[PDB]
A paper describes a structure:
However, on the cytoplasmic side, TM helices (TM3, TM4, TM5 and TM6) of DppB are well separated apart from those of DppC, generating an inverted “V-shaped” substrate translocation pathway open to the cytoplasm. Apparently, the current structure snapshots an inward-facing resting state of the DppBCDF translocator. Notably, the two ATPases, DppD and DppF, in the complex, each binds a [4Fe-4S] cluster via their respective C-terminal domain, consistent with the crystal structure of the isolated DppD from Gram-negative bacteria Thermoanaerobacter tengcongensis. In the resting state, the substrate translocation pathway of DppBCDF is inward-facing open to the cytoplasm, sealing the membrane.
Different from those structurally and mechanistically well-characterized ABC exporters that solely consist of two variable transmembrane domains (TMDs) and two highly conserved nucleotide-binding domains (NBDs), the ABC peptide importers require an additional substrate-binding protein (SBP) that captures peptide substrates and delivers them to the translocator for function.
Residue numbers in the entry:
A (entry chain B): 16 to 295
B (entry chain A): 2 to 32, 62 to 336
C (entry chain C): 3 to 325
D (entry chain D): 10 to 334
Write the structure that this text describes.
Amino acid sequence: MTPLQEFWHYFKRNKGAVVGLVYVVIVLFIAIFANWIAPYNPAEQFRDALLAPPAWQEGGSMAHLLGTDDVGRDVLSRLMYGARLSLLVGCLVVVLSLIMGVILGLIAGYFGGLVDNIIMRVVDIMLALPSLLLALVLVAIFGPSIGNAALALTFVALPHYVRLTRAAVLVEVNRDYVTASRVAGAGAMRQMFINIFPNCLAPLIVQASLGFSNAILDMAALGFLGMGAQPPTPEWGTMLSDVLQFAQSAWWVVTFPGLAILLTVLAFNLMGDGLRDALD
Amino acid sequence: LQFILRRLGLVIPTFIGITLLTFAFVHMIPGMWQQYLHYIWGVMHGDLGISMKSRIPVWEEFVPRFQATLELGVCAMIFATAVGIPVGVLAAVKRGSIFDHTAVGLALTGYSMPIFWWGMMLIMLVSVHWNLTPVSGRVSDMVFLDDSNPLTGFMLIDTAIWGEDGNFIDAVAHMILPAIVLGTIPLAVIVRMTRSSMLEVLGEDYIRTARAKGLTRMRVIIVHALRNAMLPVVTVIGLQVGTLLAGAILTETIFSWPGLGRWLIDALQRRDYPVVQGGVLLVATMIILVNLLVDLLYGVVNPRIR
Amino acid sequence: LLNVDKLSVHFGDESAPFRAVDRISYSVKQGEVVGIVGESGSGKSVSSLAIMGLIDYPGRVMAEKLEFNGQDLQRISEKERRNLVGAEVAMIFQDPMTSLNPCYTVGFQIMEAIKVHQGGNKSTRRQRAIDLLNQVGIPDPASRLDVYPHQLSGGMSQRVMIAMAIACRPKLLIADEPTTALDVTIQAQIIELLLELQQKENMALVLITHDLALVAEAAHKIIVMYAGQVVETGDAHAIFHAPRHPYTQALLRALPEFAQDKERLASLPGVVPGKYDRPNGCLLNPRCPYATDRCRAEEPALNMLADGRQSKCHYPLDDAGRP
Amino acid sequence: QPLLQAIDLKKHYPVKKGMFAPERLVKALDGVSFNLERGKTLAVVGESGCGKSTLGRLLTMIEMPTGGELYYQGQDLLKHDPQAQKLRRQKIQIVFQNPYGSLNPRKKVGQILEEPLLINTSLSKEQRREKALSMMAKVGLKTEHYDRYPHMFSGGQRQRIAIARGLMLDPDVVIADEPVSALDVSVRAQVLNLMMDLQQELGLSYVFISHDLSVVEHIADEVMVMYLGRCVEKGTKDQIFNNPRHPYTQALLSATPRLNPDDRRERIKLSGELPSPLNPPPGCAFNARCRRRFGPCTQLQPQLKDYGGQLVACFAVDQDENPQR
Ligand code: SF4
Ligand code: SF4
């Protein structure tokens, strides 16, 4: 088998991985085509049916399938537009932080010396606080908005990929083939990006899935605490920000947004389990 | 021993850095060489500032809330550790069993779980619908303790030593749900690292040597494998006790608990920057001290370090 | 002492097993030294791990007869297997660095080996450990007990392995490629130590190696293995003067020792059969210089020759090296 | 003029016990010298820690020396100058110990063989392909292997790719760091044959670093024996293998097994483990283990001397030759 073929072959071995993949695909589909598939606009108010139960409970109706929120706004519409923002910010946070983290990690791992010491020192400053507290401090300083949250989450995600890329590169640079290409005369840029990096891939393609899982939980965390996303907008964490008094009166408002976070993050941790399994 | 001098040599640069960063967050973002030495001179005298939402010194607001956070974090870690490690050992010994699958499956669930939402569901099921447990606070509104006694401020110790018969029972009642929700994540993590480390160690040649001596299966697992599989478990444990503050900021607001997380997030929402400026320095100092103690312990348990 | 008949060890799915050991049969007398030799695919070690019970569930062990000291090993209560392993059979393994537990002092690891099979007295067991470390030639036996495995050199670590194996007065000892990780002047000492213990205790010894020259000194009987099968067996002097099978002839003509100065060495063409490419008939048939139609149609029996040797060939080789 | 010449090559690694103590020198190699000739094999033999794997790293410019001189054809090879950097890489090349760790896992075989041409030469794509296929045919790999990854080759075929990679720049000296040690008996033979063939065809010289004296006996033209970073005996293949005179060589040869019963004319025993390079003995490095120890051997370090062509670093051989002492 070719390396791709062999990868997929092993991947299929894991049923959980498969199912997770399926669910991921589904949510992506939802996200992309939200506009068309959603039953109502996510800002619209049906003031005739405030806190209407889901369609299968005795008080509900088939018009509003998962019921309505306090202001008479439709939960299935809000969840599907929330899938859109949750995957959008997930992609942005993972792609920007993985680009910078690979580069700073390759530079720190290959050159050693003062350049290694200074990069790893500044990483250990920003890991001194737990990630969410540093993201909250940054979003407090620069003001709560969806964009400012995403750009705080890139900064606190970055040190984990720097640290793992360095660990992969130090396990790599002492191998004989990196020395063989140095005896043949390869320059520093060639050694890192054309000889070392293809082997550092494997350890990191699992961290992309952990990255999505953490970024969605951190978005949901910022949103629940009233930071980042703001109340008019359909985002799964902010939907749960003011809900606790409904624990007696309306179980759907509290259950469904968190169920959707759970599912999506579970799905991506299933990717990580599968990809890690499939690369050995 | 050269290893603790080595670890202090990495700690000092990071401590220096967080004092410079926390000075920058006090000199800028209000409401230079000579001014840094001054600010530090204030920190070492305990003058961390006076809060804006009420005019109490930040250190006098901190100490009672650090105590209320430590007790909850200790219960969450006892629960995690106690439950976690046995499960992870069992899972690896029973690889491929129903149990094995169950362990992994649950583990995944917990590790992928939004911790704030899980608190609301446990409140809704256990406290609101089935009425088995209390919904909020550290201890019930009808409990108070006689301030003439030398109370510690750890409510679960103080109500064991003093007060009416029923107060202790009520202290625990309030503790179980916060401990279980906070400890979920740690539990999950531990289980995964223990199972992984055990399946690495049960493949090592020294376990083949243990079997070749005729040792009983329980003695190969507990004396030979688990002794070495605990070395990774000590490191992960040290990471968990860093993330308990992020867990606490999310759970502590739901249960209305009088801890440090509710105080920090209220200060961030209210722009009470003196509480944030003092709180960041103390939380960073705590996490550095706990990392240094877990690194020192790792040095005692791993004989390659002596 | 040890009596093996039709031992087979299969790995993987029962529609198409990897036959890592395939219908082998041999016996070890009391006080005998037996060498097992073969190249990397040969299955030599798997035959011995199967006696100990160190094969895990992906592998399956079956035998017509696996008698040890008059005790059947196929249907033995686990308790009794424990009783046997470490006290009548013992084993030395390939890597001397990873074979000792890194977290316990070597005194704990010897005093444990004594505890499971003999008396428990702390003083008595420490005394027995000091006697054992004298017996394997440690420089300062009393101070070495408090030393961790990462502080020992490769040679010192393998002496501690022999001290655990010899602890309870064993009757058979298996050395699975003991010295291949070690320097030449350290190898010579460990093999002399095993042969000195063999002569002093009258115990049997099984050596597994790829180095034909090492068993040429040490062994009384040599067994040669190819592709999981036994292919020649005989007395250790004659087996390398008149080889009765094409594989031992080819394996010797590939040795530098059997060649002049700077002259080309012989070799057989092609790789060892794996799980996918098992030929019909004789397993050496793709490679063998003397092959004929019968060698493809029929699996050769392990024939016994008039001189007392055994060869798994339809045409066993004459005293001049020809069919 | 010698093809490659080394005068007093040495390497001291400075090591630190901890913050509380001075630095000290691990003298991993301490004044080796040789004259490698065109179309000849120089064999470097010794047990682990003797410095043989440092000499391979020095001569291939993987690490720089801390003294002495290395000349190729009368030109200095240890200058920093770019014109010497071309000569270094074109003329001297390496074959490594481990086949599993010396080919890059993610690159195709064609890629691995063309990379040296792409970095050093000006050859075109087609040209590079042509030269890679020609080298694979010379080394014994079929054309259809060109686009395979190294993880789908046997250990013998991996050392074939590693030898093919060395030969690309048309080298004069190929340095072989334990090249046949990981391989089994039929594959060793094969590899050896290939090597001999290439020697005979291209006119290479080998620096053969190994501890398998059996092989050495078969391959070698000139042999050098090392102990704790110094050369202790040097001479012709025949000389050393037929008439060894340093006490360590007598102990090392008699400790190797021999299949033929007549070869092991006497058995000699050392009764102790190797000195650590971190704490060298006071005098001769073999003084702790030597059958022949004598008053001078604790106080002074022996020096190589000619005793009839053979070079022997031993005061007792000196006295056997020189009774006046
Ligand atoms: S049986 Fe036939 S193929 Fe097998 S070794 Fe003998 S001659 Fe060769
Ligand atoms: S110099 Fe002395 S100690 Fe060294 S090898 Fe010669 S006789 Fe032995």
